Amino acid sequence: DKWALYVIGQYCDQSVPDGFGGTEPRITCNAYLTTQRKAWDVLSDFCSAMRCMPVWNGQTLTFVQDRPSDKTWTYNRSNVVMPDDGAPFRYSFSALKDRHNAVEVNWIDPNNGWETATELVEDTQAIARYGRNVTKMDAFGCTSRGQAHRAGLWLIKTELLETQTVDFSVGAEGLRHVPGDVIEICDDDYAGISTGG
Amino acid sequence: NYNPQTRQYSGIWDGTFKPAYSNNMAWCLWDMLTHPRYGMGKRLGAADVDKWALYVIGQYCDQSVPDGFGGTEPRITCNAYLTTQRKAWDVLSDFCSAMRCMPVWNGQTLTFVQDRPSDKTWTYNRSNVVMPDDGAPFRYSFSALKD
Amino acid sequence: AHRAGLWLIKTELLETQTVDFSVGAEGLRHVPGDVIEICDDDYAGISTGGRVLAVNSQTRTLTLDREITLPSSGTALISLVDGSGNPVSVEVQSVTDGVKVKVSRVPDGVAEYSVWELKLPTLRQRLFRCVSIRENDDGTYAITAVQH
Amino acid sequence: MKTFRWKVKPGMDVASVPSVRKVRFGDGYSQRAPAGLNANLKTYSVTLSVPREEATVLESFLEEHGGWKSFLWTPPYEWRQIKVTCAKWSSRVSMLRVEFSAEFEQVVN
Amino acid sequence: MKTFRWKVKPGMDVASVPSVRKVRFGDGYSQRAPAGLNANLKTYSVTLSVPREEATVLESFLEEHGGWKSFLWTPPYEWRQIKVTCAKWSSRVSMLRVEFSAEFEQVVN
Amino acid sequence: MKTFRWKVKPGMDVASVPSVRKVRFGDGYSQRAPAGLNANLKTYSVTLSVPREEATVLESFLEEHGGWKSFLWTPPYEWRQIKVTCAKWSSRVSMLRVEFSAEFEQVVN
Amino acid sequence: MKTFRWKVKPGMDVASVPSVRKVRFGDGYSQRAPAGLNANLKTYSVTLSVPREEATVLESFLEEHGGWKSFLWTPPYEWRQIKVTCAKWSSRVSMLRVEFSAEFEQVVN
Amino acid sequence: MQDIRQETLNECTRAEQSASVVLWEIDLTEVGGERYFFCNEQNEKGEPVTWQGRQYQPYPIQGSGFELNGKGTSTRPTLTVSNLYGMVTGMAEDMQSLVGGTVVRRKVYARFLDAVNFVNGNSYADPEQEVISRWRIEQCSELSAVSASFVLSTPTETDGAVFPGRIMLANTCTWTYRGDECGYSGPAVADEYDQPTSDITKDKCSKCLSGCKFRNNVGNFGGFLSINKLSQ
Amino acid sequence: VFQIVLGAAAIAGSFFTAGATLAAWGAAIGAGGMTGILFSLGASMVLGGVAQMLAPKARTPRIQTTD
Amino acid sequence: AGSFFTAGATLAAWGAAIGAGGMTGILFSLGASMVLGGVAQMLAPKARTPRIQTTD
Amino acid sequence: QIGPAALKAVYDMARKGARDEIQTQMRDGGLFS
Amino acid sequence: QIGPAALKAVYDMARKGARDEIQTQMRDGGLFS
Amino acid sequence: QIGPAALKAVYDMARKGARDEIQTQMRDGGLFS
Ligand code: SF4
């Protein structure tokens, strides 16, 4: 899908605070691939540097970039399949230790010398809550401190904010859905009231 | 009540740790488990690891054994220099393999089962165990030839 | 280093077999790494354990299920549980018809259908150390153990 | 409503089946415990027979509870009022009468 | 058409089996909730006896609806018009008459 | 109490089904051993018919024992006192009498 | 004891079921072998009926073997003495008689 | 051998024993919540079970996977509870899905329960007879309109931990602000963006060298301000 | 007549498989049109972390002691 | 390992009764599985060693 | 229970069990599958 | 369905499912099992 | 065979199959799972 990559590039070209008082494009290249890795490895590196995920749409290979998107449809308990147990919407949560609060991002500094510098990103508020879970990551195209910090902060913020998941198998309308479609769920059981029918 | 220089315990311990330099590998493991700065003291913490099990483990590791050069030597000793960041399980397993113990969550504390000559605690016959459909109250198995 | 290698080799050569013998409600007493003796009458050629049917404190004697045979040489011992759950041990003096035994002293509080064991002078104890205890959501505990 | 008023004609079936915890030891020895903490619930396989007009009232009463919810009933077995729930209440229609079959499960709730 | 216009035999079964959310582990405490909104939709086991000539009309109706396509029906149980579907409707063709055995599961949509 | 003191109906079933260790592969050689020490403990399917008033006493006895708590019983089979437990004891309540259908599994402890 | 003496009244059921090795080839062809080496064993579904006093003797005799062990018996089918084992011997009690049902399995042991 | 009293040992060996009840306690005090007490059963008087003077409310709850093993993975139990009427849901939206909470499980023979629970009273009531176990909540695995399921773990669980932990860095501080290693106790100076503030609620070190200088704490800086050039 | 859809409590102990009791499905054995054992992918798909459901988490070269 | 002794006990009572809530089936005794790596692994965790590098 | 419908259900349960097991063996001790 | 013959068949189907899943996980994304 | 009790038994047999199959794939040729 060339249009998905078009919108992805427009998103990656946006100007953001540099951290040194200036501005910088959101995500940038400057990789030097020298060792023959599998195509999946390089594709995953590219799709992790910018927060997208490749999915076979059905006609083209699309990319689902993690962007603030609007609601596409709304599902209540009158629009989804009911199994034997009264659970139209099943929910699940991420584990305590899978909510990381400290990240070490390895980027390559072009200023000191073209060597690997480690940038530490922390969320001290979350460290007071979920203990202290640390990870290491390689920002694939990063050569600017701001981009490495942004990657680490995106990981930390996603882990801290986005917590739960839902399985809500639906009827015949499900053919309208491509992965990466934002949908509102109006579950009267989750709420204390009734808000759909 | 433990003097690391002579490696001799005085009497009953009653807790109350003391800041002294020792080669006792059991308390090296104790430091690894319950140190807040670099170890695992933030998670876990004290009152979660059985200190008396480590006390008996250290007493066992401090016993004198033939050196092989005509002298004597403590049974098990430290002098490791950990430089590369391995997972906490890796270091814990290394410590619990150097002295022949095995960490198990007792239910209130994390105990260590040292391979020591111990005494019988209970006795079980076929009149005290569950009988399945097949008449095998006690099933047995053996280690392989190549193991 | 030699001691570590030798401990590995000796453990592999000596400790060979393991046992699974899921037990009743008493399994809550067991922590992993507890040494326990197993008196299996099928593994042996004789019977060396059972339950106590009746106790007669005067002319001190016990009634035991199965049949017990005393050894030609030495003396045998019989282990009973007293009234405080303490496993006392007594010396067997004479067994009449393999069901009625006469011992030196009947411990106080020995109730009927309590567990009795026999210790012959020429029998190995066959100790095993526990490695895993599983609650079976039933009241029975599944215990795995290895030779000691 | 709260109280079951209709009468059960032919002779109901009363099932107790208390839940126990049982362990089977070796040579004939065992271990038994009551498993639960309170009583035994007991269930009544019950049959009604009512005119073709009262059947609508009976079905409406059994539907207003709808499987959940408990109604009072005095069984003609021990003559002590208990709380029961009904979840099946099958019904067979005839020319002048309707015959109901139901399973009243006694609940502490 | 949209209305079953035949007359059923006396003996007809009406099962209810409401759908509720029930939580209970072992023999301990129990909790019951009424699950959905449209309670119980019952099930009418129905039998008909027709002359050998109108069997064609009845089966043409049933096969035209064909499992889907609910139709309007007034059961002689509560005499209130409802919407039902049929999925099996086996038949037994005697020397002079035919006996239909069908099921009606009432619906909402 | 500790002694079932009621009289059973003529028709009563006594299943034995002893427990043995049997080893055999395919149709080849077979080996049989007596397994446990306390042989077979049998099972008595028992039926009683008592008036509608003594039903309460009988059921109170059975429910007080409640699956566990074996009691003493003298079956008219061998006329030898044994210890048994009951776990089901369903009941059918006729107009003037009631019929208990219970099982007695002989025990040792 | 060794020999079964009580008589079998109603007409037993004699089951052969020899075990064979069978391979089904393609277009209707096959391959068959006797699997075992020594004949077929055959089993007898047998029913006794004995006075209420001899039932204790019959039960004691059948218990002394206890599922395992083999006793001699001469079936009234081929009139040749064989060795059998019995492992069920259910018994139903009546007013003046007891009726036993059993499955005698012939064994080479 | 567990530190369990002799009365429990006497009760374990009996042929006919009383029912073994399991009482659960959820403790969210360390994460910002209260303590809840649950038992799968009521007592003979239709009231929540009174044990050691504490009332455990009736609620469907049952655990599994409880075992004591050393070889292999650390054992992960599981606790299934009823989510009718949206109680657990309310906790999950409130207490970060109960993650980090403490589950305490007590096994008690019914014979030793307090005399309140029985109509006739209890002569053998002994509030010291119990077997206790502690676990932590790792993940609310399922939460539907019917029930909820929680994964438990031993409080040790050295899964995501590493050793040694302290990391060598330049232009960043690895200490905890105002912690013992940081050793700072001064008044509010600036926020994480080095903007000067006098507000105590907006006082946080930027973890850079300038943030340390703002508090005159450069002696306590957790970084190493030479290693960036030696690694080239 | 329904969709069962196994969750996470059913696969963790025989607890809620008897909650819905699967009576209609069990007595009906199955059907060609509808499929059983759907196995909702809630907990399994989130094991590595939420951020792994949105980005592929590029890897890093193996550490060599020689450096 | 083969449908050999599943028909030994014949599982007739359990099969006809399917089971019960209180008691659990399929226990799968941990005899052989726990001892596959060796007895010495059942008592000590068997510390590992660093990967061999040809560069040295 | 008919063979056709039961065999696929057993196969899918087996696949799900293998998933759960492979994921649980990458835990601390485990075997890393 | 008799228990003896059913348990071996279920075990063998479980083994086949484990084979299929382990081999599936050695694909691109997977888990490399 | 009731569905509730059978599904858990099938799941546990499948997990045991995963045990056995992974452990036997860590043998000489195998796949090292
Ligand atoms: S930079 Fe200085 S003031 Fe800030 S946390 Fe580190 S030591 Fe404390």
Side-chain angles (χ1 to χ4, degrees), chain H residues 173-178 181-184 205-208 211-212 215 217-218 220-222:
Chain H
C173 185
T174 61
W175 297 141
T176 308
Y177 187 41
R178 287 186 194 262
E181 288 99 15
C182 167
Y184 186 56
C205 177
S206 43
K207 305 299 192 151
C208 307
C212 215
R215 298 131 168 100
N217 227 44
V218 199
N220 277 25
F221 194 49

Side-chain angles (χ1 to χ4, degrees), chain A residues 1 7 11 47 57 61 67 90 101 115 124 152 182 185 194:
Chain A
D1 203 18
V7 185
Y11 185 79
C47 284
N57 154 20
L61 168 83
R67 243 193 325 276
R90 309 188 121 76
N101 338 119
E115 37 79 23
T124 46
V182 188
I185 286 199
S194 67

Side-chain angles (χ1 to χ4, degrees), chain H residues 98-126:
Chain H
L98 295 88
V99 131
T102 295
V103 168
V104 181
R105 151 176 148 127
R106 293 160 220 251
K107 271 193 319 177
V108 177
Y109 275 109
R111 126 198 275 268
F112 305 121
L113 280 167
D114 306 339
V116 160
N117 304 278
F118 318 112
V119 177
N120 309 63
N122 201 18
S123 78
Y124 319 94
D126 191 12

